[PDB]
């Protein structure tokens, strides 16, 4: 592989990462209180769990994976239409909601990944008109998927509210206003020992729902485990923003993606979180002398700039705001 994609020795993935047998798989059609308790335990102990019987149509999940794979099969001449000034966009502020293809790495090497990203909320003609023109059915399918994934995310956030003792709808406001859909394409890699599909990270936002069909996702528990792909499940990743708002009562998910020498992989990640204008702080309702705030209030925009640039540590984004 090109030296551009060679990860530092210490960040390279071990060849035989064991299956995460303790990754919670939570049936959302259990009794209400059982679902609240199981989600609460997973959030406190792991920060990553899967949800099944989640009420999002399996047919729509399959149709969305199909049109996302069809997009990445498009020829160069079509993909160039999403490359501003002839190259992929960077994950940097301002992060626009119009569809673009993105490159990503650490500042230095590149991740073995192409990412299509666009905003999904609120859905209006202006936003959907800025989405991919091809495939023809992308806009129709992903509009429906967007609404359904948001519905499921807001259900999970209200289970989280009951678990924390926050009023229902606590996150149904500026804290969930941005919905970025990242479709990740991992082409086959001639040397998986040297490369990463995605470097180890927290998702910086509030909560992320990840749809996957194939292996490659790994979680840090300095031990890495493999997250079993369940094609009809969503992987729920708690973000660094939720870690801060819960005053570390919940864990954030630290995860990475490894490359494969034989086959490509598409994942669909729905990133829900605050507007860039938001102030982030530990929920005052949960604070006391027994539970003092571990973070001072901060600008999400200021956090965002550090989070997207500084990868010296997983929580480099929030280190400046740590107190007590």
Ligand X SMILES: CN1[C@@H]2CC[C@H]1C[C@@H](OC(=O)[C@H](CO)c1ccccc1)C2
Ligand Y SMILES: O=C(O)CCC(=O)C(=O)O
Positions in the binding site for ligand X (CB under 6 A): 91, 95, 104, 180, 182, 198, 201, 203-205, 271, 273, 304, 307-308
C-alpha to C-alpha distance for 175 and 272, rounded to whole angstroms: 8
CB of 313 vs ligand Y, minimal distance in Å: 17
Q: Which residue has the tokens 């973000």?
A: 239
Candidate residues 226, 255, 303, 304; the one interacting with ligand Y per rule CB under 6 A: 255
Residue 238 touches ligand Y, criterion: CB under 6 A: no
Q: What angle do the packed helices 138-164 and 58-72 form, to 10 degrees?
A: 130
Q: Please say whether the beta carbons of 111 and 197 come within 8 A.
A: yes
For Sr ion, the closer CB: 132 or 163: 132
Residue with Cβ nearer ligand Y (153 or 198): 198
104 binds Fe ion (CB under 5 A): no
| Residue 182 makes contact with ligand Y by CB under 6 A | yes
Q: Is 217 helix (H, G, I), strand (E, B) or coil?
A: strand
217 binds, among ligand X, Fe ion, ligand Y, none (CB under 5 to 8 A by kind): ligand Y
Beta carbon of residue 318, minimum distance to ligand Y (angstroms, whole number): 17
- Whether residue 152 contacts residue 209, with contact meaning beta carbons closer than 8 Å, is answered with yes
List binding-site positions for 2-oxoglutarate: 184, 186, 265, 267
Q: Determine if 198 is a binding residue for ligand Y (CB under 6 A).
A: yes
Per the structure block, which two tokens stand in for 261?
């020498």
How deeply is 284 buried, as exposed, middle or buried, from its count of CB atoms within 10 A (0-12, 13-18, 19+)?
Answer: exposed
Can you name the residues that pair with 50 across neighbouring β-strands? 25, 235
DSSP 157: H
Least distance CB 268 / ligand Y (angstroms) = 9
Q: Which residues bind ligand Y (CB under 6 A)?
A: 182, 184, 198, 203, 210, 212, 217, 255, 257, 267, 269
């Amino acid at each position: 592989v090109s030296e551009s994609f060679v990860a530092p020795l210490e960040k390279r993935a071990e060849n035989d990462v064991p299956l995460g047998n303790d990754v919670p798989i939570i049936d959302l059609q259990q009794d209400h209180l059982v679902v609240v308790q199981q989600i609460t335990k997973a959030c406190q102990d792991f920060g990553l769990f899967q949800v099944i019987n989640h009420g999002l149509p399996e047919k729509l999940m399959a149709e969305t994976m199909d049109v996302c794979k069809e997009f990445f099969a498009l020829p160069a001449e079509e993909k160039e239409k999403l490359q501003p000034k002839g190259e992929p966009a960077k994950f940097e502020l301002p992060l626009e909601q119009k569809a673009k293809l993105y490159v990503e790495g650490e500042q230095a090497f590149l991740y073995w990944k192409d990412t299509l990203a666009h905003g999904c909320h609120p859905l209006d003609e202006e936003l959907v008109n800025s989405w991919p023109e091809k495939p023809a059915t992308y806009r129709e399918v992903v509009a429906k998927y967007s609404v359904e994934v948001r519905k499921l995310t807001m259900r999970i956030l209200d289970y989280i509210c009951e678990g924390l003792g926050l009023k229902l709808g606590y996150f149904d406001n500026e804290l969930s206003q941005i919905q970025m859909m990242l479709t990740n394409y991992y082409p086959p890699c001639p040397d998986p020992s040297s490369t990463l599909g995605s470097g180890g990270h927290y998702d910086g936002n509030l909560i992320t729902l990840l749809q996957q069909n194939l292996p490659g996702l790994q979680q840090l528990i300095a031990k890495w485990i493999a997250v079993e792909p369940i094609p009809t499940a969503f992987v729920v990743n708690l973000g660094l923003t939720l870690k801060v708002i819960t005053n570390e009562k919940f864990e954030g998910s630290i995860h990475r993606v490894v490359t494969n020498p034989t086959r490509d992989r598409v994942s669909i990640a729905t990133f829900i979180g605050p507007d860039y204008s938001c102030t982030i702080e530990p929920a005052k309702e949960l604070l006391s002398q027994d539970n003092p705030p571990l973070y001072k209030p901060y600008s999400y925009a200021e956090f965002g700039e550090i989070y997207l640039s500084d990868k010296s540590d997983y929580d480099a984004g929030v280190k400046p705001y740590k107190i007590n």
